[PDB]
Design a protein around this ligand. Structure first.
Ligand SMILES: [Mg+2]
Ligand SMILES: [Mg+2]
Lengths: 339, 339
């Protein structure tokens, strides 16, 4: 909320530190300038919810007598690592989907004189994560824990992306691969691990809570939250209010494996399957319009409303069962935001 | 030599291990199949000199009584990690340069139905490195040492690539940035660190030789070897015998910051600067032909021959000064190969 503004003032330092360390290394200066420009363009401009979840979870987890200036600096920094992870995926995903814009502005790769060099820029964003961890956390006992958490998060995200790409190739309608089992799997690997587990898990490690069982417990809660966030993201893509949401969805144009299309397909009498087969994923409006209306005719907006109520109950039951011995608030803060 | 065939039989195991671990995870199977195909296509087909340098250096470094079946399995595996690092860079560099072929065959990204998804495939190759290290080396005392060595190698390579891209944009002649200082810097960061330091450094760590001073010593030797390898690569690109080398060079078409162009520019009377300005980096033959002949007229092939003699002396002096207490053979094996 106000904690945000603080997180963002810290970026300047993040950047300073990552774009200087050549003082006996002159000649690489120009690549360092380019790294400065990649960071400023790609890490800034989002809502920062993931990085901040790190900072908030850290405050709530650490028995207050161990929060000095330096401990807090390590939390802002690790929060910024989560944001750099995000940045890395987005720069790359935008190239792969040929997107035009991101966070309201021109995608980095679409900028004149960047193009496919953005592939190296994305790799730099990733590498910046480990450079930060070494700079700030090298002497901490949880250092290796965090390196492995970031590496694993990346791999989960990447393999989820591979699954998404095998499942939903833009320009090729095949709804035989749009199943519930496959929708759930994409979300867990591609979105939920890094969006929800990673930031809390990182806070836990910084707090000394490294147990397998405790982490599995938190993960159970957080992956289920992640599933909901994304299902809500998909519903709102089409049925959101663009003023409240902040852009019009193209999930259906893009032949996305949307929670909607999945639900739609669970409920289609053979004709409707065809109505969807001849309309899902097309440039033109009348085709998208007709899909939205098919959705409305199956009362998907109400299936969603029912799903969200149930899902909310279920999350609370999960917090009740699996939060201890972590303060339930760690999870409830995130529930409040996503619901 | 014969040690090679062995390294390559081990690949099958590498792959098996990386493409199975879902046995309670069914639904991600298909992404794992795709990962299998990325590994088989991208990690196989080269000379394997870097991975093998790991295995050879490990045998020479470890006091022979600590080489059991498992220690050796960790060396083959870490050798394969170096090869996966290589694979990751190449898949990505080939997209960025829009190359057509690699190791005689169609670049992965040019394959039908791959295209820019190869960006996620490259990221997977990178992630496979850390998955292998965790699988085989997690309980070793040098585990963190190796994770940091691979991460640093990647960052050095990436930032070198950024410098190369700022220096030599394909389609834009500017020879004011082709300096000796800038040529040397590109090679150190882009090529030599990962090609020469990384494999030996990794062997050292597996052997318990983790000292800062010893590593700086080996690095001094190995970066200088790397500079020579690349300078020889550039010379041979144009003056090599295509039967002995194995392809015709396009360095001059590609407006590469070649050691040649650099030398050429150190020796050009103002007219010649123009002769190069109006001919470097063009599609057509007559333009390339004319550059080759300008090079021949400056006796670059002899400047090279003189450079290689001096460089050889210098490497031997470096081994003499900086090898101890490592067996000089560790370095001499590599000298024999590159010279
Ligand atoms: Mg969406
Ligand atoms: Mg070459």
């Amino acid at each position: 909320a106000q904690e945000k503004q603080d997180f963002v003032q810290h970026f300047s330092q993040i950047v300073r530190v990552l774009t200087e360390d050549e003082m006996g290394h002159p000649e690489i200066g120009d690549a360092i300038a380019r790294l400065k420009e990649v960071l400023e363009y790609n890490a800034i401009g989002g809502k920062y919810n993931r990085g901040l979840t790190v900072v908030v979870a850290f405050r709530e987890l650490v028995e207050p007598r161990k929060q000095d200036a330096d401990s807090l600096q390590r939390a802002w920094t690790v929060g910024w690592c989560v944001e750099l992870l995000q940045a890395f995926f987005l720069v790359a995903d935008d190239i792969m989907d040929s997107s035009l814009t991101r966070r309201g502005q021109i995608c980095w790769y679409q900028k004149p004189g960047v193009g496919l060099d953005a592939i190296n820029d994305a790799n730099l964003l990733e590498a910046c994560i480990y450079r930060l961890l070494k700079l700030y956390c090298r002497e901490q006992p949880y250092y290796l824990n965090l390196i492995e958490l970031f590496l694993q998060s990346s791999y989960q995200t990447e393999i989820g992306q591979t699954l998404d790409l095998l499942t939903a190739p833009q320009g090729n309608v095949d709804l035989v691969r749009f199943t519930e089992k496959r929708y759930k799997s994409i979300v867990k690997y591609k979105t939920a691990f890094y969006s929800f587990y990673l930031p809390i898990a990182a806070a836990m490690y910084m707090a000394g809570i490294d147990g397998e069982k405790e982490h599995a417990n938190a993960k159970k809660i957080l992956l289920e939250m992640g599933e909901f966030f994304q299902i809500q993201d998909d519903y709102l893509d089409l049925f959101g209010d663009p003023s409240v949401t902040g852009k019009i969805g193209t999930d259906i144009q893009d032949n996305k494996c949307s929670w909607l299309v999945v639900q739609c397909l669970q409920r289609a009498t053979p004709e409707q399957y065809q109505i969807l087969k001849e309309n899902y994923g097309q440039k033109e409006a009348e085709k998208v319009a007709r899909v939205k209306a098919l959705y409305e005719e199956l009362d998907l907006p109400a299936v969603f409303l029912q799903y969200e109520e149930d899902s909310y109950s279920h999350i609370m039951a999960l917090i009740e069962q699996y939060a201890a011995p972590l303060p339930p608030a760690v999870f409830l803060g995130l529930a409040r935001k996503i619901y």
